[PDB]
């Protein structure tokens, strides 16, 4: 704080590391989804949350949430993980992109349709 | 030509014998549009009684400000409790660009185009109190020249 003390040793704010080690800080990665689960949340909430566990293409084995009502994932099903924490499940840090490699769009959906991988219904 | 406006209403509580009792606090600022700024606090059991006590206290307890053409004169810093507040005259630096609860007091104060930036705490009850203190100890070139001879 004294200016001599800063000449001797300057200020230094820490690095504030990343929530998502999707390495290189890439927007999506792809993985193999080693298994598929349902997992109970933390205390104020209760549900069964549909969550896969994925061997990414960079080596990391990370678990990942599966959005929307109902999926078609089973154990090999190469998916595209996205980045984004589900706070209610302890330790999922990622999401799966619905409407991507082996992850179909959400069936019978009409609103917020782009974020669930669903094409525009012809009418 | 009174130009009143309310900044913040809150629900405070008391915790008596049988449960809690909920009261409402207003915080308003009135001002004519040419100096003459006041604020009033006022608290009551319902919201319209609270705002009415706040306006009624704010119409009295009103302070003169030595404005420039449409704005401040020199950059001024006002502090109150934990809330430190800067202002800069911004000689036609268009539009009142102040924080919340400072935009209102500067709006009804009659100033039009200053630059602000509140620091510290930014509780609305103390960020005015730090704008009036501020606009109160801002003096004009005919007051400084009155003090120091010329």
């Amino acid at each position: 704080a004294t200016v001599n003390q800063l000449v001797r040793k300057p200020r230094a704010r820490k690095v504030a590391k990343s929530n998502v080690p999707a390495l290189e800080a890439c927007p999506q990665k792809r993985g193999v989804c080693t298994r598929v689960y349902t997992t109970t949340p933390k205390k104020p909430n209760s549900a069964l949350r549909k969550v896969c566990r994925v061997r990414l293409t960079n080596g990391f084995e990370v678990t990942s949430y599966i959005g929307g009502e109902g999926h078609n994932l089973q154990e090999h099903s190469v998916i595209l993980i996205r980045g984004g924490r589900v706070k209610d499940l302890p330790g999922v840090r990622y999401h799966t992109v619905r409407g991507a490699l082996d992850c179909s769009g959400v069936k019978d959906r009409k609103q917020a349709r782009s974020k669930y991988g669903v094409k525009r219904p012809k009418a | 030509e009174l130009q009143e406006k309310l900044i913040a209403v809150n629900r405070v509580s008391k915790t008596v014998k049988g449960g809690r009792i909920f009261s409402f606090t207003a915080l308003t600022v009135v001002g004519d549009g040419n100096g003459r700024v006041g604020f009033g606090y006022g608290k009551a059991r319902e919201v319209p009684a609270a705002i009415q006590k706040a306006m009624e206290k704010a119409r009295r307890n009103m302070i003169n400000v030595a404005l420039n053409n449409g704005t401040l004169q020199h950059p001024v810093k006002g502090v109150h409790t934990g809330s430190r507040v800067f202002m800069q005259p911004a000689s036609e630096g268009t539009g009142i660009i102040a924080g919340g609860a400072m935009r209102a007091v500067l709006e009804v104060a009659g100033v039009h185009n200053v630059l602000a930036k509140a620091y510290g705490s930014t509780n609305p009850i103390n960020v005015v109190r730090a704008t009036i203190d501020g606009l109160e100890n801002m003096n004009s070139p005919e007051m400084v020249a009155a003090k120091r001879g010329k």
Partner: protein, 80 residues
């Protein structure tokens, strides 16, 4: 004229050469405080007249060894 510097002898013991500390007094780029700052230079002198603790002026010349691109002009202020 020539550009020269002034400094003091920091050590002596080498075979027709000397080493001179220069004190430049430079403002800190962030903090705005004028701070002393040295520059040690290996300086040549024929017949090694200046001892330790002196003050000597110094000019730049061709290379005479590794580093050593500096040679004295005038020894002042030798007082022990």
């Amino acid at each position: 004229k020539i550009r020269t510097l002034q400094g003091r002898v920091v050590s002596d013991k080498m075979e027709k050469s000397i080493v001179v500390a220069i004190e430049r007094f430079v403002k800190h780029p962030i903090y705005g405080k004028f701070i002393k700052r040295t520059t040690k230079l290996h300086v040549h002198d024929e017949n090694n007249e200046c001892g330790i603790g002196d003050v000597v002026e110094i000019r730049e010349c061709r290379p005479l060894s590794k580093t050593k691109s500096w040679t004295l002009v005038r020894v002042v202020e030798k007082a022990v």
